[PDB]
Design a protein around this ligand. Sequence first.
Ligand SMILES: [Zn+2]
Ligand SMILES: [Zn+2]
Ligand SMILES: [Zn+2]
Ligand SMILES: [Zn+2]
Lengths: 273, 273
Amino acid sequence: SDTKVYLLDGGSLVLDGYHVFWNRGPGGEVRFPVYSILIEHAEGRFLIDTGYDYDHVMKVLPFEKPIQEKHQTIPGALGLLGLEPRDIDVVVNSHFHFDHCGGNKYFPHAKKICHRSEVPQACNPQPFEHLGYSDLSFSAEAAEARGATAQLLEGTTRANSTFEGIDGDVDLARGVKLISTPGHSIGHYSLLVEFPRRKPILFTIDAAYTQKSLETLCQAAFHIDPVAGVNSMRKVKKLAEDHGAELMYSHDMDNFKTYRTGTQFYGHHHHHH
Amino acid sequence: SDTKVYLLDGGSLVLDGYHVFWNRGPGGEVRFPVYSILIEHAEGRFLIDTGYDYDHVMKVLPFEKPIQEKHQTIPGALGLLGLEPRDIDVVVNSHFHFDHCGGNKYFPHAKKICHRSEVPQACNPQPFEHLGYSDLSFSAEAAEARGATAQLLEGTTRANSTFEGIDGDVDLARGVKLISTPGHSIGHYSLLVEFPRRKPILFTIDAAYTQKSLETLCQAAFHIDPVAGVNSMRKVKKLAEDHGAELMYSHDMDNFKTYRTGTQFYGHHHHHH
Ligand SMILES: [Zn+2]
Ligand SMILES: [Zn+2]
Ligand SMILES: [Zn+2]
Ligand SMILES: [Zn+2]
């Protein structure tokens, strides 16, 4: 049971270049991918993030012009792998912006994990965080707090949408580490996956939308604390250098086109060793 | 010697709507005014902010498309009033973004006041604050720290560009209060001017670029701490309500067209009392 990582292509959204590169831009529409990270591990199947819900975006953020085919929903992407939501044991959310938790609703059976601060933030966000924390279907508690119980999928209860809260740099499983990278959101996590026979991969998630972002220390305009945001970028750069990790970014179309998705995966076996 | 306020029209700049209304926009060019606040007081002439320097903006931020006529430089605006820079006793800066300190160079003789944190921030800004703190001509110390001594007007020395640092809500002079409103910058100040015979005026300066900004608690994309930024907006709304103060905003063209500028002023004498 060697560690494998499968990227679940979740389609795309659009933001202004001023959203993507805070203050710098240039301005104008930029379309970027959204994906989730499925880890097939000895300890179980872990899904980090769950993309966006198409209907939610069309209702609440239609200016983000979602494109998402049937195979780019979470059930659809899992289907490419001959899996279904019930095959996933643990769901981890990097943060509860709508584009990272829109598929949580399909995983009532799963254990849920997130930073200790994130459910409380979803319940009572800053005034400027309402569009980010706009989809409360991942939490009956948060939906109730926000007056958004109408968003709840039938069958979602407090009992099946409670999160175990974590803090700091901690192990999710053997060789899978959650790296605290606050700034974009109060409890934002990045992800370091180690493999038995290859160098690690550091998924920046929303601590760095693109390669350019991390190079230039220019974060996204969506953030709660930009000082933290930069410090977290430095932390990520240093961690990658230390571990000799390969960096992969959350919302970077040019790089994403070069990433393995669908039935392609990271963590291959040897063939002559 | 009753308190009078004269607004020195300093021309205009452009930003994207996403700069003005953080994340909200809409996008596209928005042209807005820049002005400085001259207070003729019993205790002396106080100038709060000094606009932008045209050459600096054309060199370093030409995408802000400055428009500034001869009478819209600080010496030109003072000239409309039959004054010159040497007539000003005290210069106060709300913060050291380039559009509020570009005329400081003309006031070596004056006492200078600013938040205790602002010269240090100009010397060592966050990576994302370099375009805001781009004009160091207001401080030989900051220019030296930033490698920008070339920006210094001949005759500028540490001795004539040192600031007295303040903190908290404090009086500048009788009935002139500096209101701490951090968030847009680490030591940002707003200004409350009281008059002997009329209601006060609360100049939000960059704690709220526009009326819409303060109404919606939607601050500018230029900030160091947006949580502070919102808290400061609430502070300003409450202070205005308490004092029954008239609110005036820093970068709001529609409102600015209704403001008194040039030889027009606030704080008129009675005529039959
Ligand atoms: Zn996010
Ligand atoms: Zn995102
Ligand atoms: Zn400013
Ligand atoms: Zn300004």
